[PDB]
Symmetry: C3
Subunit: 148 residues, 3 copies
């Protein structure tokens, strides 16, 4: 299997795929909140689900969208950085720690966001998860620059 | 050519690249709607295109942005999942079906969204396209986990 | 090192990683603008940073989010297209030009956006940067299609 192309790759692929699934969970939750709060973005949706008055914004729907947007701002860069980093021959344990900190930090971020936990819990989880991303980015920079 | 690194890879790369182009089409349409409806997001844009009163929201512009956002929520994960999945040695025909269902579902989604088609047409196309994504995600999970 | 898998790959990885860092800069700027303008998206944030009246929109915060969103609309596709393109055996210099035009155009885009530069400066930088993306997309299309 090509999953064993580098020692760090299986761990990366596991964490990444779980994070993609975690984004899908946010999408599904968003839909549930739209239905339960009767807050649809489109008149065609509203007309099917009770009437035109239900084409409206809702604070919980907006919160769901913010969490999903923040995921796109952070998880997508990780999918790139972590993949490249997996092939730079990092220490297996060190690589695992990078991926695990990102995974745990991001899951915690969604819990803190959707759960409306007191500040600065969400902001701390965000910061924590970005640390391994910064680390991988710098490592890629050095490796790429030195091969020019 | 490195396109033949796995039997499924050419089909993946074709479908993916078409989907990226399809997102670019949404970006271009968005610009056209801004110009034709005179609805700009920035005062500097509005001042060039008729005056400060044209820095305003518009329902069709907002709809375009929703379609584009939904694309980012779904197509970007597919770019990751489909790439990895291509290297897991799936059945060539089965892989093609995964990619084709996503491609057709997503093109249909944009048509249903921008075309303001009756519900639940858009929601059904969304659901259809997510099915192969869920399938690939699970397959990657098993392969990654078993190589830990 | 696997960075030398293709002659164009180091240049791609350098430009890409710089662009990811450039997105991170936008995220950090956004946070700074929220703090300095006292404009928070969440009541829990506002209550920590002065009171509930600070859960409010702000034009500069919205501008930051637009720049970040536009980055997600363009840089993420480049991460995909440029990676694949690096393995299609393009002319080293031609590939560098594709990556450099995207890098320079996108950095200029953020400067023009956050700097509120007169139109059509931002729109021109956007257009310029999309040109190598269109070029790479077409090249991938031909290579993928011919290997079907
Ligand atoms: C993210 C994801 C991953 C994997 C599989 C997924 C499978 C589905 C999936 N959805 C994400 C939330 C969506 C959701 O709950 N939308 C609701 C809010 C506005 C409209 C309403 C749709 C109702 C509906 C849906 C489908 C068919 C008919 C109807 C109807 O109107 O009868 C549904 C699709 N995500 C998935
Ligand atoms: C997505 C994509 C892929 C490949 C190539 C692309 C090439 C271009 C491209 N655009 C996406 C829609 C944008 C658009 O229509 N914007 C208009 C709405 C607000 C401002 C206005 C801009 C007008 C303008 C543009 C360029 C130069 C001068 C002016 C002017 O003001 O004279 C233009 C760039 N996307 C592309
Ligand atoms: C993008 C990125 C890359 C690499 C490393 C990064 C490291 C951090 C990082 N931030 C992106 C801007 C965020 C920011 O400035 N947020 C402020 C606006 C609303 C709330 C406020 C948070 C204040 C805060 C933050 C952390 C801990 C405690 C508190 C507090 O309340 O005491 C902070 C996290 N991005 C990074
Ligand atoms: C990956 C998806 C994670 C979903 C985490 C949802 C956390 C829900 O948490 C809930 O939040 C409510 C406020 O929204 C509170 O009223 C409840 O006390 C709390 O249980
Ligand atoms: C990939 C890009 C797909 C673009 C699909 C655009 C579909 C346009 O479809 C149009 O939508 C209008 C409402 O918006 C209707 O008034 C028209 O009847 C319909 O033809
Ligand atoms: C990658 C991040 C690039 C940040 C570029 C920020 C450009 C700031 O530029 C500033 O913009 C202000 C308006 O916003 C103007 O008042 C100032 O004259 C100008 O210096
Ligand atoms: N787009 C972000 C940029 C900065 C950021 O990511 N901040 C973190 C920590 S405060 C966050 O959780 N932001 C909430 C959000 O993006 O909605 C924002 O508007 O806040
Ligand atoms: N961000 C989405 C999450 C759920 C989703 O993707 N729903 C599908 C099927 S209803 C959709 O087409 N949503 C419209 C949109 O994202 O604007 C939303 O707000 O609806
Ligand atoms: N989502 C974009 C689609 C078109 C686009 O990307 N336009 C360029 C050139 S005008 C841009 O800089 N848009 C500003 C933005 O996306 O906020 C929009 O709403 O304008
Ligand atoms: C936001 C600040 C986080 C910094 C992450 C540290 O990242 C570290 O940078 C070093 C020097 O470039 C590298 O040698 C090291 O491999 C890397 O883990
Ligand atoms: C949203 C529900 C869609 C489920 C997609 C099914 O996905 C399937 O899962 C099986 C069991 O894990 C795998 O053996 C199989 O390869 C995969 O195609
Ligand atoms: C938006 C218009 C930009 C077009 C980019 C041109 O792209 C070019 O297309 C040719 C024909 O397909 C290819 O032979 C060539 O390799 C490619 O650079």
């Amino acid at each position: 299997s090509l999953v064993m192309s580098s020692p760090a790759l299986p761990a990366f692929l596991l964490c990444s795929t779980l994070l993609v699934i975690k984004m899908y969970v946010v999408a599904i939750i968003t839909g549930q909140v739209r239905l339960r709060k009767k807050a649809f973005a489109n008149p065609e949706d509203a007309l099917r689900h009770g009437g035109p008055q239900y084409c409206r914004s809702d604070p919980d729907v907006e919160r769901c969208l913010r969490a999903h947007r923040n995921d796109m701002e952070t998880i997508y860069p990780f999918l790139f950085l972590g993949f490249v980093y997996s092939f730079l021959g990092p220490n297996p344990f060190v690589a695992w720690m990078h991926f695990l900190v990102f995974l745990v930090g991001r899951v915690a971020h969604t819990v803190a966001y959707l759960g409306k936990l007191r500040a600065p819990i969400r902001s701390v989880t965000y910061t924590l998860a970005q640390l391994p991303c910064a680390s991988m980015a710098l490592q890629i920079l050095w490796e790429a620059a030195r091969h020019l």
